[PDB]
């Protein structure tokens, strides 16, 4: 009855001619399947009649095609997360397949704790190994259905969380010492005259000694475990994570905007390419690539014994070079920086918004010399330009979000450890381990609940928001009708 | 309304006590005792600085919370009949959340100019320190209040636009300008917060 | 030179950091429990489906607890009155951030619980809005942590 | 005290191989576009993250506070 | 009742426990300088020398191995229960 | 692989009786959207309105039968050869006759339910009588 109802609905949508008993129906079919469509006519010409052909109707009026591009295997799960917006707009679509990994859904961890990544991978791998019986058996709950749809992304995000935990060198908030650790204490104290602090350091200089003497040299892979067991961990990790934030966000948004150039050159339109997106890239670069280059220059052009007069000063140049820097400044004024700054401001703030204006009126003049609603065009262009110019800064600030989750997850893991495990491991081995089973089970439950799922879900959706507000809202815009074949969805 | 009555009573009683103590002080030729200078001097500038930082981030975050809930309730109410608005309208929500971000980075910058003192007396030790502490407290209060108020405005406007979208989905683009105006007003607040603490030395 | 009554500010910073977050979590739990009770009268199968606002309030309370524990463990007898005001500011900030986050969590969780009782397809979208609430409280935590050193 | 030239060279070489190794097509069968984009993105992103971390660790302006009160304990290490 | 969910949770928790406490025991046997804060300390051992530190390191390590031992025990018990439940049908 | 997959549109010529078979075959294939061509229909110009009404009646009958079965707690296990064949016009009458026999059985069940309601009223009377047996003590 459902098949009959669909058939009669289509016939109602179809048209009936008066010249013959034939019917003409408008059909949206893929180019690849056209032959199969003809095969249907081959069934028609065999048993019921012989005069039922199909002809490609190649006109341009309306005929807004459906998307139908969502044809893929298990990776289709990725598309579903992108499918929250309904891309449409024909072949302009450039969504998941370009991103997949570099998408804000595989750097959707920023919480890799080695062990947390291995737990996620183990869960997803066990679930993928059991997917046969899982789909064969009845579903448990809608949340389980979502997890089943996402299993592939869950597993690959687990792999990336493992890698991020390795580079962060924070396994359950406890670092890992592999192939050396750099730093030392005896060279710092004997040469540095900070010796004879065996018990005096435990009586006079509590938590005092932090000085680099003859030291240096980074971890070949990640972050030294000494930074983890220290107490200035918060400041160094904060600066490092914020700078990593800036560089990652700037390169990501640059790639997102750059994809739009290809997106538009595919759809001809040379006026927009040479007048609308070149200003966007120019402004974005002149305002943010300068900050990235400054960050790298500060990282590379100094050393431990090079802080200006004061002992450390941490960074002291990251923030005082604001987005306007009117005058004065002092501090770091390396030759040419003032001129470069002024040139970037004039080319970006003063020129880019001005040339982003006009657009179709330029053609209209020629049109007016040949023999469009100016108002709506220019007002929409103006609102889009102000939206983009403010949104560059807004999304640069909003890219800072996942790093707060990173810091919070690190602190949560560290405090959970120091509050449960540190209590559970002590002296009087018999009493210290008879109840270790219960305390460690509590640790497992807490790590599963607040860290694996809760914070995991928080990061899961944070990165999707970063996708859908700034990452993918740069190259693709608009909506379109999705696919709709006769799949007999009713079983 | 009992809570409102209690708050009004406390307000009026405290203000009556203040005006009566002021008139008593000025009548009894006891003006020197009512020393505002001693209060602003012997008070530690560290309290002013830290209270400014805390308010700068806290007012921002609570204004953002006001906006996000006042718009989320509207979205969920108006999204029952049209599920498509459950995500498309989200472009007007992140504003509020991004508004809260305009606090934390700000809360960093002011906190970037905090140093210890190792001094107790107020005579010629702390003049520039006094100015720095008061200026950064003022900047923190400015950013916190402006950010909270712009967040509540943006949330209100976003709820209105979201309910507008429930009938004709083609007016969202035409109506997007009001909330970005509100966000720009918050940007003005953050800009003056930057400028206020731009040139201040602490130490 | 250690001034007296120095630990007072840090003590009430820790107390506020704990208490305000606790109150926000309690309000969120109460509002979402009322919403769940209202919704469960017609869709019994959807009870554990949307119990998550309660765990969100628990997460906010966890943020309050961790900030309070850190501040208390940083407390010493001889506070130089520069650290104590830092602790108090961080505590007040995170406490009011948790209060606001719990407020939004409770209100939006009740609304979304009613909606998902009525319209089953609305849950996931609600998720996004709800998750943003936690972020706000989260900000308090991070702005406390940087305030724990500088 | 760790040498930096050798680790950066070896990791740059390895990530460059896995990045520009797609022209060496293993399947040449199914879609083949998702896999090349995946490999290139993974290599570039992982290399960028590792380089950012190691460059941040380079030139330690301020030393960590080994406040464990066990400096005498780590002196052996 | 020995439900399948309970047995599965017990088995996975037991495996989690055995692997983690074995790696704790190994890391204590090498005496890595990361878990030093976790390791109990008494002020009278500061001047004694590293020998006492290594002795208490060995003691807490042995504690960890016996903990993993009863973890293996209850994991085996859960495995026996779930296998009996499966073979009953 | 590439995210273009050009769609393009086409016209589908048909016949009088061949249209049903061809459309059923295409629905089995299922690769076409069939954008509407006549907007001014509003069901009143649906041509096959009577067929749609028959389908609606069959759907209502099926829904009532399924609700009764679920009240009876009977499984709907129907695995195997689920897409047998699109329904021909002639066999629709026989299927409707079988459904009408099922509906007659359901009507007999409803009459039984009414008799059960009468019996439940009798049972309530019996319970009130059970109370009257003890009320003799209250009479004293």
Q: What is the 3-state secondary structure (H, E, C) of A49-78?
A: CCCCCEEEECCCCCCCCCCCCCCCCCCHHH
Q: How far apart, in Å, are the Cα atoms of B176 and each of B98, B101, B181, F74?
A: 16, 21, 9, 54
Q: Does D32 contact chain F (CB < 8 Å)?
A: yes
CA proximity to C91, closest of C62, C65, C56, C60? C65
**Distance between CA C103 and CA D8 in Å, rounded?**
50
Residue B88, both tokens: 């498309």
**Distance between CA A369 and CA B177 in Å, rounded?**
35
**Distance between CA A174 and CA A409 in Å, rounded?**
13
Residues in B closer than 8 angstroms to C111, CB to CB, are: 72-73, 76-77
Which of the 8 DSSP states describes residue C149? T
Find the closest chain D residue to A184 by CA distance: D75
Q: Are B194 and B129 in contact (CB under 8 A)?
A: no
Max alpha carbon distance in chain A (Å)? 110
Residues in C closer than 8 angstroms to A316, CB to CB, are: none
Residues linked to residue F9 through DSSP beta bridges, in sequence order: A28, A57
Cβ partners under 8 Å of residue A389, min gap 6: A283, A352, A353
Of B50, B57, B100, Cβ closest to residue C88: B50
Residues in A closer than 8 angstroms to C128, CB to CB, are: 461, 464-465
Alpha carbon E41 to its chain centroid, in Å, reads: 21
Hey, are the CB atoms on C131 and A141 less than 8 Å from each other?
no
Residue B57, both tokens: 């981030």
Residues linked to residue A25 through DSSP beta bridges, in sequence order: F12
- Half-sphere exposure in the Cβ direction for A190 (13 Å, CA): 6
Residue F138, both tokens: 């209250």
Residues linked to residue A24 through DSSP beta bridges, in sequence order: A15, F13
Neighbours of chain E (3+ CB pairs under 8 A): A, D
**Distance between CA F59 and CA F67 in Å, rounded?**
12
Find the closest chain A residue to D74 by CA distance: A185
Cα R_g (chain D), whole angstroms? 20
Phi, psi for residue C73 in degrees, rounded to 5? -70, -25
Smallest CA–CA separation between D32 and chain F, in Å? 7
Can chain B be said to touch chain A, i.e. do they have 3 or more Cβ pairs within 8 angstroms? Answer: yes
Q: Are B45 and B115 in contact (CB under 8 A)?
A: no
Smallest CA–CA separation between A48 and chain F, in Å? 5
Q: Chain A to chain F, count of Cβ pairs less than 8 Å apart?
A: 216
Q: Does C93 contact chain B (CB < 8 Å)?
A: yes
Torsional sign, CA A321, B50, A235, B63: negative
Cβ partners under 8 Å of residue E33, min gap 6: A177, A225, A229, D73, D74, D77
**Distance between CA A24 and CA F37 in Å, rounded?**
9
CA proximity to A102, closest of A248, A222, A284? A248
Neighbours of chain B (3+ CB pairs under 8 A): A, C
Hey, are the CB atoms on E70 and A437 less than 8 Å from each other?
yes
Preferred mutation among D70, D71, D75 to probe E, highest tally of E CBs within 10 A: D70
Q: How far apart, in Å, are the Cα atoms of B194 and each of A380, B96, B100, B105, C139?
A: 32, 20, 16, 11, 20
Smallest CA–CA separation between D4 and chain F, in Å? 41
Q: Are C17 and C67 in contact (CB under 8 A)?
A: yes
Q: Does D2 contact chain A (CB < 8 Å)?
A: yes
Smallest CA–CA separation between A310 and chain E, in Å? 31
Residue corresponding to tokens 């706000």: C136
**Distance between CA A115 and CA A123 in Å, rounded?**
12
Preferred mutation among F2, F8, F81, F83 to probe A, highest tally of A CBs within 10 A: F8
Residues in A closer than 8 angstroms to D65, CB to CB, are: 207, 209-210, 230-232
Three-state DSSP state, A437: helix
Hey, are the CB atoms on B117 and C82 less than 8 Å from each other?
yes
Q: Are B195 and B143 in contact (CB under 8 A)?
A: no
**Distance between CA F12 and CA A485 in Å, rounded?**
15
**Distance between CA C110 and CA C54 in Å, rounded?**
11
Q: Does D57 contact chain A (CB < 8 Å)?
A: yes
Preferred mutation among B42, B68, B103, B163 to probe C, highest tally of C CBs within 10 A: B68
Neighbours of chain F (3+ CB pairs under 8 A): A, D
Of E33, E41, E46, Cβ closest to residue D74: E33
Residue C130, both tokens: 């709800």
Q: Does E46 contact chain D (CB < 8 Å)?
A: yes
Which of the 8 DSSP states describes residue A273? I
List residues of E whose CB lies inside 8 A of any A CB: 13, 16-17, 20-21, 32-40, 43, 46-47, 56, 59-60, 62-64, 66-67, 70-71, 74
Residue C3: exposed, middle, or buried by beta-carbon count in 10 A (0-12, 13-18, 19+)? exposed
Can chain F be said to touch chain D, i.e. do they have 3 or more Cβ pairs within 8 angstroms? Answer: yes
Return residues 368-397 of A near B (CB < 8 Å): 380, 383, 386-387, 390, 394, 397
**Distance between CA A415 and CA A174 in Å, rounded?**
11
Residues in A closer than 8 angstroms to E33, CB to CB, are: 177, 225, 229
The experimental method, as deposited, was cryo-EM
Smallest CA–CA separation between D12 and chain E, in Å? 30
Q: Does B89 contact chain A (CB < 8 Å)?
A: no
Cβ partners under 8 Å of residue A369, min gap 6: none
Of A28, A44, A55, Cβ closest to residue F22: A44
* Cβ contacts of C122-127, under 8 Å, gap ≥ 24: C122/B76, C122/B79, C122/B80, C122/B83, C122/B86, C123/A142, C123/C49, C123/C50, C124/A146, C124/B86, C125/B75, C125/B79, C125/B83, C125/B86, C125/B87, C126/B72, C126/B76, C126/B86, C127/A461
Q: Does A16 contact chain B (CB < 8 Å)?
A: no
Smallest CA–CA separation between B148 and chain A, in Å? 17
Q: Where are the alpha helices (DSSP H) in chain F?
A: 18-29, 49-72, 89-139
Q: Are A446 and A416 in contact (CB under 8 A)?
A: yes
Residue corresponding to tokens 């947390």: A116
Q: Are C108 and C30 in contact (CB under 8 A)?
A: no
Residue E60, both tokens: 């807490």
Q: Does B91 contact chain C (CB < 8 Å)?
A: no
Q: Are A372 and B162 in contact (CB under 8 A)?
A: no
**Distance between CA A59 and CA C85 in Å, rounded?**
74
CB atoms within 10 A of CB A276: 19
**Distance between CA B145 and CA D53 in Å, rounded?**
37
**N- to C-terminal Cα distance for chain A?**
13
Of D68, D72, D76, Cβ closest to residue E46: D72
Hey, are the CB atoms on D37 and A300 less than 8 Å from each other?
no
Smallest CA–CA separation between A420 and chain E, in Å? 11
Cβ partners under 8 Å of residue A108, min gap 6: A157, A160, A459, A460, A462, A463, A464
Find the closest chain D residue to A202 by CA distance: D69
Smallest CA–CA separation between D21 and chain A, in Å? 17
Of A101, A209, A226, Cβ closest to residue D38: A101
Share of chain B residues as helix, strand and coil, in percent rounded to the nearest 5 = 75, 0, 25
Q: Chain B to chain C, count of Cβ pairs less than 8 Å apart?
A: 147
Q: Are A279 and A349 in contact (CB under 8 A)?
A: no
D69 torsion bin: left (phi>0), alpha (psi -120 to 50), beta (else): left
Return residues 88-117 of C near A (CB < 8 Å): none
Q: Are A420 and E1 in contact (CB under 8 A)?
A: no
3-state secondary structure B41-84: HHCCHHHHHHHHHHHHHHHHHHHHHHHHHHHHHHHHHHCCCCCC
């Amino acid at each position: 009855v459902r098949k009959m109802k669909a058939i009669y609905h289509t016939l109602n949508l179809c048209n009936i001619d008066v010249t013959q008993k034939c019917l003409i129906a408008e059909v949206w079919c893929p180019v690849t399947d056209l032959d199969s469509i003809q095969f249907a006519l081959r069934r028609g010409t065999e048993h019921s009649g012989s005069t039922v052909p199909s002809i490609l109707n190649r006109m341009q009026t309306n005929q807004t095609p459906p998307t139908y591009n969502k044809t893929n295997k298990f990776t289709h799960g990725f598309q579903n997360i992108v499918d929250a917006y309904g891309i449409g707009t024909y072949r302009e679509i450039n969504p998941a397949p370009y991103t997949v990994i570099t998408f804000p859904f595989l750097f959707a961890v920023m919480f890799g704790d080695f062990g947390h990544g291995i737990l996620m991978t183990l869960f997803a791998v066990w679930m993928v190994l059991r997917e046969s019986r899982i789909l064969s058996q009845k579903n448990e709950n809608e949340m389980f259905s979502m997890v089943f749809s996402g299993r592939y992304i869950i597993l690959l995000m687990g792999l990336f969380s493992i890698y991020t935990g390795l580079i962060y060198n924070d396994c359950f908030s406890k670092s890992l010492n592999i192939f050396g650790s750099s730093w030392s204490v005896r060279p710092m104290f004997t040469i540095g005259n900070w010796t004879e602090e065996t018990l005096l350091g435990s009586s006079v200089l509590q938590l005092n000694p932090a000085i680099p003497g003859v030291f240096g040299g980074p971890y070949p892979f990640g972050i030294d475990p000494i930074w983890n067991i220290a107490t200035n961990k918060l400041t160094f990790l904060n600066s490092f994570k914020m700078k990593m934030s800036v560089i990652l966000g700037i390169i990501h948004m640059l790639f997102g905007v750059s994809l739009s150039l290809f997106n538009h050159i595919y759809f001809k339109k040379p006026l927009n390419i040479y007048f609308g997106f070149i200003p966007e890239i120019i402004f974005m670069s002149s305002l943010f690539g300068y900050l990235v280059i400054l960050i790298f220059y500060k990282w590379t052009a100094y050393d431990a014994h090079s802080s200006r007069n004061a002992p450390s000063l941490l960074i002291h140049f990251i923030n005082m070079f604001l987005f306007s820097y009117p005058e004065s400044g002092n501090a770091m004024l390396y030759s040419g920086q003032k001129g470069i700054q002024c040139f970037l401001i004039v080319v970006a703030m003063l020129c880019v918004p001005w040339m982003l204006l006009f657009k179709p009126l330029i053609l209209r003049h020629q049109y007016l010399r040949k023999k469009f609603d100016f108002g709506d065009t220019m007002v929409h262009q103006a609102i889009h330009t102000i939206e983009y110019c403010l949104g560059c800064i807004s999304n640069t600030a909003s890219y800072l979000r996942l790093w707060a989750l990173s810091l919070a997850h690190a602190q949560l893991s560290e405090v959970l450890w120091t509050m449960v495990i540190h209590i559970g491991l002590h002296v009087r081995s018999l009493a210290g381990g008879l109840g270790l089973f219960f305390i460690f089970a509590a640790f497992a439950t807490l790590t599963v609940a607040i860290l694996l799922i809760m914070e995991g879900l928080s990061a899961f959706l944070h990165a999707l928001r970063l996708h859908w507000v700034e990452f993918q809202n740069k190259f693709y815009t608009g909506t379109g009708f999705k696919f709709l074949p006769f799949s007999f969805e009713h079983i | 309304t009992g809570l409102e009555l209690l708050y009004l009573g406390i307000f009026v009683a405290f203000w009556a006590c203040m005006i009566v103590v002021g008139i008593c002080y000025t009548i009894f030729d006891l003006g020197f005792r009512f020393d505002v200078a001693w209060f602003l001097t012997e008070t530690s500038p560290f309290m002013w600085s830290n209270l400014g930082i805390g308010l700068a981030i806290s007012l921002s975050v609570v204004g953002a919370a006001w906006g996000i809930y006042i718009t989320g309730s509207s979205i969920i109410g108006g999204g029952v009949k049209a599920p498509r608005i459950k995500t498309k309208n989200l472009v007007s929500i992140i504003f509020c959340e991004a508004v809260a971000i305009y606090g934390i980075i700000m809360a960093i910058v002011i906190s970037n100019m905090a140093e210890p003192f190792s001094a107790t007396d107020p005579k010629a030790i702390g003049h520039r320190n006094y100015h720095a502490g008061y200026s950064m407290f003022g900047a923190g209060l400015t950013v916190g209040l402006s950010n909270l108020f712009c967040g509540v405005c943006v949330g209100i406007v976003g709820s209105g636009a979201a309910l507008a979208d429930a009938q004709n989905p083609s007016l969202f683009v035409k109506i997007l300008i009001v909330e970005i105006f509100g966000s720009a007003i918050g940007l003005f607040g953050v800009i003056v917060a930057i400028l206020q603490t731009s040139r201040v030395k602490m130490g | 030179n250690n001034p007296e009554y120095s630990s007072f500010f840090g003590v009430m910073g820790a107390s506020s950091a704990m208490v305000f977050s606790a109150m926000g979590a309690a309000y969120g739990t109460a509002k979402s429990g009322t919403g769940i009770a209202a919704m469960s009268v017609m869709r019994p199968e959807l009870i554990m489906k949307s119990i998550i606002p309660v765990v969100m309030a628990g997460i906010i309370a966890i943020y309050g607890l961790v900030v309070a524990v850190l501040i208390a463990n940083s407390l010493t007898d001889g506070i130089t009155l520069y650290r104590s005001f830092l602790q108090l500011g961080a505590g007040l900030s995170v406490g009011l951030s948790g209060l606001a986050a719990g407020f939004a969590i409770g209100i939006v969780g009740d609304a979304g619980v009613r909606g998902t009782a009525q319209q089953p397809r609305l849950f996931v979208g609600m998720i996004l809005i709800l998750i943003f609430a936690e972020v706000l409280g989260l900000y308090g935590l991070i702005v406390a942590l940087i305030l724990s050193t500088k | 005290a760790h040498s930096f030239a050798l680790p950066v060279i070896i990791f740059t070489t390895f990530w460059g191989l896995i990045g520009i190794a797609g022209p060496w097509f293993v399947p040449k069968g199914p879609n083949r576009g998702v896999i090349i984009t995946m490999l290139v993105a993974t290599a570039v992103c992982c290399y960028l993250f590792w380089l950012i971390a190691i460059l941040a660790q380079l030139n330690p302006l301020f030393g960590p506070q080994l406040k464990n009160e066990t400096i005498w304990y780590v002196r052996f290490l | 009742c020995c439900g399948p969910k309970l047995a599965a949770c017990g088995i996975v928790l037991s495996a989690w426990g055995v692997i983690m406490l074995i790696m704790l025991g190994i890391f204590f046997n090498v005496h890595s300088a990361v878990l030093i804060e976790d390791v109990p300390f008494t002020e009278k051992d500061f001047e004694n020398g590293p020998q006492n530190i290594y002795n208490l390191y060995e003691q807490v390590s042995y504690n960890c191995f016996i903990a993993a031992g009863l973890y293996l025990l209850l994991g085996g018990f859960s495995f026996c229960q779930v296998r009996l439940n499966k073979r009953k049908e | 692989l590439f995210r273009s997959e050009e769609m393009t549109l086409a016209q589908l010529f048909l016949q009088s009786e061949a249209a049903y078979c061809c459309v059923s075959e295409l629905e089995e294939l299922g690769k076409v959207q069939f954008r509407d061509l006549n907007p001014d229909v509003n069901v009143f110009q649906r041509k096959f309105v009577n067929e749609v009404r028959r389908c609606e009646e069959m759907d209502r009958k099926l829904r009532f039968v399924e609700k009764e079965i679920r009240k009876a707690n009977i499984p709907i296990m129907d695995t195997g050869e689920n897409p047998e064949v699109p329904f021909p016009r002639d066999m629709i009458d026989l299927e409707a006759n079988f459904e009408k026999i099922e509906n007659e059985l359901k009507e007999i069940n409803t009459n039984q339910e009414a008799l059960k309601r009468n019996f439940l009223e009798l049972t309530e009377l019996k319970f009130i009588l059970r109370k009257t047996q003890q009320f003799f003590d209250e009479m004293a």
